[PDB]
Amino acid sequence: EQDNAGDTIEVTEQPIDNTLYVNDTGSYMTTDFGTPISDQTSLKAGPRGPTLLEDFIFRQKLQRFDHERVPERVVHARGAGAYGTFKSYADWSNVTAADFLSANDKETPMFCRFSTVVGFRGSVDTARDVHGHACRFYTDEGNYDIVGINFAPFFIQDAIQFPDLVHAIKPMPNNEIPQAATAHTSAWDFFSQQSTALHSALWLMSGNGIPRSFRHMNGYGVHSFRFVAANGTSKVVRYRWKSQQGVASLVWDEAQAAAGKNSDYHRQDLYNAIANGHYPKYELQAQIMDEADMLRFGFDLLDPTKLVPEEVVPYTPLGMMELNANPTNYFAEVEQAGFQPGHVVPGIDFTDDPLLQGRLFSYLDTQLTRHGGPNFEQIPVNRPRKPVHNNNRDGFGQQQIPTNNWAYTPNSMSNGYPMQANQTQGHGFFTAPYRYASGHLVRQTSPTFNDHWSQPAMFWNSLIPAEQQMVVNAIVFENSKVNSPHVRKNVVNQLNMVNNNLAVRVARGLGLDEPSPNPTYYTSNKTSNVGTFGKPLLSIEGLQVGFLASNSHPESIKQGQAMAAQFSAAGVDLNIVTEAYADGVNTTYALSDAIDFDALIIADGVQSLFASPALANQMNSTATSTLYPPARPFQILVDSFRYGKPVAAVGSGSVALKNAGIDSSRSGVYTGSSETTEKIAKEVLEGLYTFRFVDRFALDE
Amino acid sequence: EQDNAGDTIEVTEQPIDNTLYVNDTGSYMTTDFGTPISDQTSLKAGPRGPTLLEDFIFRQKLQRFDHERVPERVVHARGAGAYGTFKSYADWSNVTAADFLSANDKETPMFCRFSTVVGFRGSVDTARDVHGHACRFYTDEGNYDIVGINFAPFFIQDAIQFPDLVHAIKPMPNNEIPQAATAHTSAWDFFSQQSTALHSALWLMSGNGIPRSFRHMNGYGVHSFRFVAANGTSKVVRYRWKSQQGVASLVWDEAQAAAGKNSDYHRQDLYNAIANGHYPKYELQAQIMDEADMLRFGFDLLDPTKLVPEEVVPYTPLGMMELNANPTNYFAEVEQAGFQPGHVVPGIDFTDDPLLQGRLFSYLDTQLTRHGGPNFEQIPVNRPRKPVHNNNRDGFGQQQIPTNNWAYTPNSMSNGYPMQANQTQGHGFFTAPYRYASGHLVRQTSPTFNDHWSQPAMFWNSLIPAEQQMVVNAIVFENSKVNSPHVRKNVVNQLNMVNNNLAVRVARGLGLDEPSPNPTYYTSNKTSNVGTFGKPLLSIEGLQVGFLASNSHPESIKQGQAMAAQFSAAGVDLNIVTEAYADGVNTTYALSDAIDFDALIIADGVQSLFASPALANQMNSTATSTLYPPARPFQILVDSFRYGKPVAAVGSGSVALKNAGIDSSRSGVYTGSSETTEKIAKEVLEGLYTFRFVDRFALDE
Ligand code: HEM
Ligand code: HEM
Ligand SMILES: [Cl-]
Ligand SMILES: [Cl-]
């Protein structure tokens, strides 16, 4: 660049302020251009006069405000994030050249966001939905994102259908009803006309659609990807994030109650858990398969509507992630984060999964919408941990200052920088070299993709009877909300290709004719770890206990408080509830509901709070408590029991149980005198692990 | 423009397609550039091959999809719209030169949007909140927008504080919790440190915060505006939209239930009412005051925290609006609509209200954010009904084609077009000519604005005892959710400057020390039409009745059906509810809740459905119905009664009432034999007008 005076360029770097995190301590307010200000009164022509155009303080403040909002994500708008770390279990170089997997105990920084799918930005956490599980590894060789969900299969087999699925499940276009729900004609029409959807539709109707929290679901990559070794050999892999807390879910009416009582239930759960030191963990696992396995198992590994059963190919544990810090600013870090499945690193490659292939286009393009311009990767949360060097330039919102004035390749002026990186130098990305294609250029679906029903059948067989009833109840609920009889009937006919018992039970729920067995795709096969009831949690850290006490019986508070040490030691929060705040009280009846607690304990001597609605109704007007709605304590109890949660009662607390028709002989009901509270606590710990007592759920066939 | 050949310009208008409403009937799918396509399979290198970059069909479809979203409104994101018409009661030219008010029976097209304030796009309709009431008159002299709310006063006195109020009430910035709610430290901190907020805070805690529907609230302009007559004389006016349905509201726990059962409760209500021919009406009214009235009434008419009591200045009816059509496409017409208080027409002017003055800047600027460019008024819903002519040009998304090549004033080339319009020619806008200012250029608040407490006191005195209890319960609920004791105490102290009884009751609810009377700002004054309980509705059209029946007692359905004619004739929807769809059934237990009905009727012979939760709990597992959660029918009944709704029972239905502890002697409880169903219906019509039976609500002091 310097064989002459003209092309020789003097660089003078200016001492520009380079703040990242903003710290207000000690400061006076300034404009964005650094002039010290107050911001509390408009400049006016006299104190009762009109506001002046020259009040630039007013205009800069309101212009910022008027422009705060950005487009939400077209899908997964409602979500929450956290930072963490990932530790490799091994040097995996034998199967992948990926750097974050290259050594035992190698640690990589992480950022993840969890979300629903269909609802808009402020929709209810406990909507029935798919849930996103999207994690970025900030590796030494680039940001690697696994952008997954809590179900193993997806609804469709080609990315070109994605706007069809999404418009179908989103609110109707004429009136934007209903919010965050598939319970409408268009969605079930789509799922029944596009029968690839059945597998994921069953997942959605199961407890998987309504998880207890982000900490109590698994994550799946869904698609086949490739691990590529340094020498070019590849393996076909499928990812699972196995929650180290375990898998647990709500029941529908409980998910509804939670939506109305605490729309922030899952984001609050994640925030509180991290803030309280109960850091959620998920183990990265992969089914590591050979190229020869593409069609071996009787379905196609390119097909995203199909899971590989653990019993056919086991999951190999790769390493452990932990999320251990909350974001500092939600808008800056969470709202602006843009995950992309095309954010790959050397040692990872794609497959010809037609669903995956289109996602690679879509996510890069969509980042423009939400960020207003092309420099979205420059936002701090999206930056790689090492500095970027390439010949990309300019664009709205450019906050870097390139010094390489020869921004093209090949050139003879820049000393070869930046250098081309590839398989054999600079740890460059490379497509797996044995990949091959051969064929006409076709817009045709592979016939290997044609079985839409067998895997739905396996999934059904994989659920305990209580959760099978839950699926029926959900399908019946959603298809009763569907307004079109012909769609209802199409759904039944589709379900009958999956399992006759399922379809008959649904048709009965809908008041429709019962179909007859259609055995073509039926199977008795089943797989494990795809249900959400009947298997206990692996950790009860960060779960909640509600201890129902009264200010009118002061010893009840003290009884609550003496149990607190035991729960604290298990990482369980004990919440003492009374009518109103007082010494030792944590929360109140008026603020409380069953959904707020994972187990409930009734204190000794407070039985009189637990009047049934019928009793409440006699004495109305005067001398009924104003401090909470009529029969609130009773309702918390009855709801907790109905939902399947452990309930305990100390002393005369058992009177409350009887009032509620709860026999002390039921599973997950613990009783004891005031002298045995220590043992009652440990039984509650026991019940928290079991989590739900499914013997309480009504069964049909 | 043509005294020479060079400046003479040939205009050739091209036959360009000019579709507005899109009609698909008969058509093949095409790209946006008109090439006929299919859109169901990606183009691949072989049927199991990778997707090709040259598949432009895939890319155009996903690029559209990837870019569907736009920024939501910074406030009032959650809302719903409808078209209608406005009829003037008179020629009002004696007080205003406004054209839409210039003749008896003069009709003007309308479009309105109603909304909450704090929640984001998909937040729950029944959040406790301010509600927007924003209406556009498409006049012959421009689009006139009244951008109002359902409360008479606003929280702050200067527009520069608007981002402070909004950041305070919106979710916290670190974690974006909580959604659509003021129940957190920051909001109550703001309301207590910025004590102007007390008036609107009391409105918010009343039933006004939780209306039954958009049809059952009023609208207020809040600010003083001016009517300006042709000759320059002005009047100071305040607007009210008086609902012709009447004012009705929910109770808090009911608003919560509705949020979890039907997040679309208000938008669905409005959509259904219009679709069913029950068109909501609101009468435009104005307090028409003299310039001399600015300080006469012991507060300042420039002050938006102050209402003028109807008893001091009556509302003059101006005309009647009716909303009579749903939008065709929600995104195009509702989401994109941009109302602005600066959208004024000749005969309307502003005042020096410092809150109003800033809104004039803010709304014009904010339209850029949501529309991506400056041509937001070109969107169909924002267009005036007559063609625009001005010298504004260009900008993103320009879909017009100007023919005037001399786009500046003054010029000698364009034949004087377009002509300047003013007070005396072309019906031009004009500022009211007697307006005057005089003063230093000051950033100071007017001392006339200093009384923050007297009007809050009047408002409190204006509520029936039951709604006063509702305010206390709300304040106590929200301030129990506030995590900061010092903020709780500040709120109490502020409330004690308003009314000692109010403050003592709140402090009791919060477990705080009771303050002592602080009489400086106390008053016994009261005003009418500012409460939401204790005054019946004026129309029951579009309200809902739930008729609880059973498939296991088939005559119950027929009993329901024979009542339907009477409800239909009142414009009331009768919904027959059973376990599952069948001949004559409208909805199901599993889909139903108390919030779905405004009155409940229990059929003869179905009492066995109405088992209490206690009874449900005995027989669990087998032979409990799978068709709805345990004790769902009972819960609907108990909830309806608790909320204050009319309930009726035919025949042995009274057994259900007894089970629920509801005596047939209570107000708003109707019973009769199977032979008197006609009379039972008319009593239910009676109860619908009364709407809520406040004798059921617990009272304190
Ligand atoms: C296996 C199937 C899929 C999974 C597991 C998946 C996963 C996800 C996740 C987890 C998010 C949220 C990321 C975040 O938290 O910010 C997301 C967003 C998105 N997805 Fe998907 N997705 C799938 C299929 C598709 C398909 C086929 C397309 C389109 C071709 C697509 C387009 C999008 C878009 C446009 C976004 C918005 C991203 C943004 O604005 O940053 N997805 N997806
Ligand atoms: C008397 C007090 C006020 C009332 C009655 C009021 C009313 C409303 C209403 C009804 C909307 C929703 C319009 C729609 O449905 O699209 C709205 C939006 C808005 N308001 Fe206000 N407002 C008030 C105070 C303010 C103040 C002081 C400011 C700022 C200086 C402000 C800024 C905004 C903005 C930026 C929007 C978004 C508008 C859009 O994106 O189109 N408001 N307001
Ligand atoms: Cl492949
Ligand atoms: Cl003025």
DSSP per-residue string spanning B575-603:
EEEESS--TT--EEGGG--GGG-SEEEEP
- Give the SS3 label for residue A547: strand
Q: Say whether residue B36 is in contact with chain A using an 8 A CB cutoff.
A: no
User: What are the phi and psi torsion angles at A635 (to 5°)?
Assistant: -65, -40
Contact, B514 vs B496, CB < 8 A? Answer: no
Kindly list the distances between the CA atom of residue B170 and the CA atoms of B77, B129, B364, in Å, as whole numbers in the listed order. 12, 11, 22
Contact, A509 vs A474, CB < 8 A? Answer: no
The number of beta carbons lying within 10 Å of the beta carbon of residue A384 is 17
> Could you tell me which residues come within 8 angstroms of residue A531 by beta carbon, excluding any fewer than 6 positions away?
A206, A207, A208, A247, A462, A463, A464, A467
Long-range contacts of B627-632 (CB under 8 A, 24+ apart): B627/A476, B627/A509, B627/B579, B627/B580, B627/B588, B627/B589, B627/B590, B628/B579, B628/B588, B628/B589, B628/B590, B629/A252, B629/A253, B629/A642, B629/B590, B630/A642, B630/A698, B631/A638, B632/B589, B632/B590, B632/B592
For chain B, give the residues followed by a break (C–N over 2.5 Å): none
Contact assignment for A441 to B119 by CB distance below 8 Å: no
Q: Greatest CA separation found in chain B? A: 100
User: What are the phi and psi torsion angles at B531 (to 5°)?
Assistant: -105, 175
C-alpha–C-alpha distance, residues A620 and A441, integer Å: 77
Contact, B455 vs B305, CB < 8 A? Answer: yes
> For residue B433, what are its two tokens?
């000519």
Give CA angle at B283 (B278, B286), nearest 5°: 165
C-alpha–C-alpha distance, residues B458 and B440, integer Å: 35
Q: What letter represents residue A45's amino acid? A: A
C-alpha–C-alpha distance, residues A527 and A287, integer Å: 15
Q: What letter represents residue A238's amino acid? A: R
C-alpha–C-alpha distance, residues B259 and B158, integer Å: 33
Q: Which of B41, B287, B7 is nearest to A159 (CA)?
A: B41
Cis peptide before A317 (omega within 30 of 0): no
DSSP states of A604-639 as a string?
TT-GGGG--HHHHHHS-SSSS-SSS-TTHHHHHHHH
Cα within 13 Å of Cα(A42), Cβ side: 30
Resolution (A): 1.8
User: What are the phi and psi torsion angles at B284 (to 5°)?
Assistant: -75, 125
C-alpha–C-alpha distance, residues B420 and B430, integer Å: 12
Cα-to-centroid distance, B95 and ligand 4 (Å):
17
> For residue B466, what are its two tokens?
């039951």
Q: Which residue lies with its CA nearest to atom 26 of ligand 2?
A: B359
C-alpha–C-alpha distance, residues B183 and B117, integer Å: 14
> For residue B655, what are its two tokens?
């057994």
Contact, B128 vs B209, CB < 8 A? Answer: yes
For B188-214, give the secondary structure using H, E and C: HHHHHHCHHHHHHHHHHHCHHHCECCH
Kindly list the distances between the CA atom of residue B537 and the CA atoms of B532, B682, B691, in Å, as whole numbers in the listed order. 10, 16, 7
Contact, B143 vs B382, CB < 8 A? Answer: yes
Residue numbers of B between 436 and 495 with CB closer than 8 Å to A: 437-448, 469, 472-473, 476-477, 480-481
Q: Which of A304, A135, A292 is nearest to A224 (CA)?
A: A304
C-alpha–C-alpha distance, residues B239 and B319, integer Å: 12
Give CA angle at B394 (B390, B399), nearest 5°: 90
C-alpha–C-alpha distance, residues B150 and B222, integer Å: 9
Write down the residue that tokens 């698994």 correspond to: A218
Mutate to test the pocket of ligand 1, among A76, A240, A301, A353 (most ligand atoms within 8 A of CB): A76
**Residues in chain B, overall count:** 701
Q: Which helix (H) or strand (E) covers residue A228, if one does?
A: strand A225-228
Q: Which helix (H) or strand (E) covers residue B375, if one does?
A: none
C-alpha–C-alpha distance, residues A507 and A485, integer Å: 11
Contact, B301 vs B235, CB < 8 A? Answer: no
Cα within 13 Å of Cα(B86), Cβ side: 28
Query: Assign residue B10 a region: left if phi > 0, alpha if psi is -120 to 50, beta otherwise?
Result: beta
C-alpha–C-alpha distance, residues A560 and A546, integer Å: 9
Contact, A586 vs A577, CB < 8 A? Answer: yes
Cis peptide before B178 (omega within 30 of 0): yes
State the pairing for strand pair B573-578/B544-548. Answer: parallel
Contact, B179 vs B442, CB < 8 A? Answer: no
Contact, A135 vs A100, CB < 8 A? Answer: no
Write down the residue that tokens 């957190």 correspond to: B184
> For residue A293, what are its two tokens?
């396995």
DSSP states of B462-525 as a string?
TS-HHHHHHHHHHHHHHHHHS--HHHHHHHHHHHHTT-HHHHHHHHHHHT-PPP---GGG----
Cis peptide before A418 (omega within 30 of 0): yes
- Give the SS3 label for residue B421: coil
Q: Which of A455, A448, A475 is nearest to A527 (CA)?
A: A455
> Could you tell me which residues come within 8 angstroms of residue B192 by beta carbon, excluding any fewer than 6 positions away?
B487, B490, B491, B493, B494
For chain B, percent helix, then strand, then coil, each to nearest 5? 35, 15, 50
C-alpha–C-alpha distance, residues B239 and A125, integer Å: 39
Q: What letter represents residue A346's amino acid? A: P
User: What are the phi and psi torsion angles at A97 (to 5°)?
Assistant: -80, 5
Q: Which of B18, B206, B29, B55 is nearest to B130 (CA)?
A: B206
Task: For residue B36, give the DSSP letter.
Answer: B
C-alpha–C-alpha distance, residues A592 and A570, integer Å: 23
Contact, A265 vs A211, CB < 8 A? Answer: no
C-alpha–C-alpha distance, residues A343 and A370, integer Å: 18
Helices (H), B216-307: 252-261, 265-275
The number of beta carbons lying within 10 Å of the beta carbon of residue B525 is 14
Bridge partners, residue B133, by sequence: B114, B148
Q: Say whether residue B272 is in contact with chain A using an 8 A CB cutoff.
A: no
Bridge partners, residue B113, by sequence: B81, B134
State the pairing for strand pair A348-349/A225-228. Answer: antiparallel
C-alpha–C-alpha distance, residues A574 and B237, integer Å: 57
> For residue A212, what are its two tokens?
């207890």
Cα within 13 Å of Cα(B77), Cβ side: 29
Q: Which of A162, A297, A253, A281 is nearest to A635 (CA)?
A: A253
> Could you tell me which residues come within 8 angstroms of residue B34 by beta carbon, excluding any fewer than 6 positions away?
none
C-alpha–C-alpha distance, residues A573 and A320, integer Å: 26
C-alpha–C-alpha distance, residues B648 and B678, integer Å: 12
Q: Which of A321, A240, A327 is nearest to A281 (CA)?
A: A321
Contact, A246 vs A211, CB < 8 A? Answer: no
Bridge partners, residue A602, by sequence: A548, A649
State the pairing for strand pair B281-289/B225-228. Answer: unpaired
The number of beta carbons lying within 10 Å of the beta carbon of residue B402 is 13
Cα-to-centroid distance, B75 and ligand 2 (Å):
7
> With a 6 A CB cut-off, is B81 part of the ligand 2 pocket?
no
C-alpha–C-alpha distance, residues A331 and A340, integer Å: 19
C-alpha–C-alpha distance, residues A124 and B263, integer Å: 9
**Inter-helix orientation angle A465-481/A500-510, to 10°:** 40
C-alpha–C-alpha distance, residues B385 and A429, integer Å: 58
Q: What letter represents residue B690's amino acid? A: T
Contact assignment for A173 to B591 by CB distance below 8 Å: no
**Smallest Cβ distance to A616: which of B119, B441, B661?**
B661
Contact, A126 vs A259, CB < 8 A? Answer: yes
The distance from CA A98 to its chain's CA centroid, rounded to whole angstroms, is: 26
Residues of B in contact with A67 (CB under 8 A): 365-366, 368-369
Q: Which residue lies with its CA nearest to atom 6 of ligand 2?
A: B148
C-alpha–C-alpha distance, residues B84 and B114, integer Å: 14
For CA atoms A587, A589, A593, A598, give the dihedral sign.
positive
Cis peptide before B515 (omega within 30 of 0): no
> Could you tell me which residues come within 8 angstroms of residue A307 by beta carbon, excluding any fewer than 6 positions away?
A152, A153, A220, A238, A455, A527, A530
> Could you tell me which residues come within 8 angstroms of residue A232 by beta carbon, excluding any fewer than 6 positions away?
A423, A432, A433, A434
> Could you tell me which residues come within 8 angstroms of residue B204 by beta carbon, excluding any fewer than 6 positions away?
B128, B129, B130, B151, B182, B474
Cis peptide before B171 (omega within 30 of 0): no
Q: Say whether residue A140 is in contact with chain B using an 8 A CB cutoff.
A: no
Task: For residue A36, give the DSSP letter.
Answer: B
The distance from CA A268 to its chain's CA centroid, rounded to whole angstroms, is: 13
Kindly list the distances between the CA atom of residue B261 and the CA atoms of A206, A254, A267, A632, B5, in Å, as whole numbers in the listed order. 19, 11, 20, 19, 72
Contact, A78 vs A120, CB < 8 A? Answer: yes
Contact, B87 vs B357, CB < 8 A? Answer: no
User: What are the phi and psi torsion angles at B493 (to 5°)?
Assistant: -65, -40
B28 is in an annotated binding site: no
Helices (H), B511-631: 554-562, 564-569, 613-618
C-alpha–C-alpha distance, residues B56 and A426, integer Å: 34
Write down the residue that tokens 């310009």 correspond to: B9
Contact assignment for B49 to A352 by CB distance below 8 Å: yes
> For residue A366, what are its two tokens?
């969509």
> For residue A310, what are its two tokens?
């653990």
**Residues in chain A, overall count:** 701
C-alpha–C-alpha distance, residues A577 and A557, integer Å: 8
Residue B5 C-alpha, separation from nearest chain A C-alpha, in angstroms: 43
Cis peptide before A178 (omega within 30 of 0): yes
For CA atoms B468, B470, B473, B476, give the dihedral sign.
negative
Bridge partners, residue B669, by sequence: B647
Write down the residue that tokens 């928290």 correspond to: A688
Helices (H), A301-415: 354-371
Contact, A630 vs A613, CB < 8 A? Answer: yes
Residue B160 C-alpha, separation from nearest chain A C-alpha, in angstroms: 6
Q: Say whether residue B618 is in contact with chain A using an 8 A CB cutoff.
A: yes
C-alpha–C-alpha distance, residues A509 and B305, integer Å: 54
Bridge partners, residue A320, by sequence: A87, A283
Kindly list the distances between the CA atom of residue B143 and the CA atoms of A601, A666, B110, B681, in Å, as whole numbers in the listed order. 61, 67, 9, 45
> For residue A658, what are its two tokens?
């009887």
Q: Which of A220, A204, A216 is nearest to A128 (CA)?
A: A204
Q: Say whether residue B173 is in contact with chain A using an 8 A CB cutoff.
A: yes
Cα within 13 Å of Cα(A227), Cβ side: 24
Residue B569 C-alpha, separation from nearest chain A C-alpha, in angstroms: 24
C-alpha–C-alpha distance, residues B387 and A470, integer Å: 58
Kindly list the distances between the CA atom of residue B11 and the CA atoms of A283, B6, B401, in Å, as whole numbers in the listed order. 70, 14, 11
C-alpha–C-alpha distance, residues A490 and B221, integer Å: 51
**Per-residue exposure over A413-425, b if at least 16 CB sit within 10 Å of its own CB, e if not:** ebeeeeeeeebee
